[PDB]
Amino acid sequence: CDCSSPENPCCDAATCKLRPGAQCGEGLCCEQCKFSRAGKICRIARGDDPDDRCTGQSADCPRY
Amino acid sequence: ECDCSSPENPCCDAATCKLRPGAQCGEGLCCEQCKFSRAGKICRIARGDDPDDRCTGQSADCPRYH
Structure with missing residues (x-):
């Protein structure tokens, strides 16, 4: 299934x-x-790392 | 908190x-x-007239084609 919950x-x-x-x-x-x-920030990074951003192409927040 | 679901x-x-x-x-x-x-690797076989799902090259999920 594409959703883990039937609700x-x-x-x-x-x-x-x-x-x-x-x-x-x-x-x-x-x-x-x-x-x-695409480019919506989805995880705040710390130190000198770039923030993670949405791809426009997928629903997970991937490592940038 | 973590980037992997399991400590193994x-x-x-x-x-x-x-x-x-x-x-x-x-x-x-x-x-x-x-x-x-x-980018473009097939990651889910579709049926009927649907396009197969493909990897983005910038994420580890297999997303619905659009």
């Missing part, structure tokens, strides 16, 4: 796959079942 | 539980030896 409205109940038009159902870079905009 | 994962420094030097990931269909898979 999640981002997935069609009948198939447990993403509902029509949906790109995601969870993650720091998921907003109303769509990918966050 | 060698992709993370044991002392900090953050990604070891040079690592980009520790898990996921688009993670290969603690590095992101190449």
Whole structure:
């Protein structure tokens, strides 16, 4: 399934796959079942590291 | 807090539980030896007329194509 919970409205109940038009159902870079905009900051870094940012292409917040 | 779900994962420094030097990931269909898979690698086979899902080259998840 594309959603770990059957309560999640981002997935069609009948198939447990993403509902029509949906790109995601969870993650720091998921907003109303769509990918966050590319470059949205999703993890604050410390020391001299760059902040992590959303890809536009995925719902996880990857290491930059 | 941590970059790996399990302390056994060698992709993370044991002392900090953050990604070891040079690592980009520790898990996921688009993670290969603690590095992101190449952009466009197929990571989920689709059916009917759907495009297959592909790795981004900048994340370790396998996202829905768009």
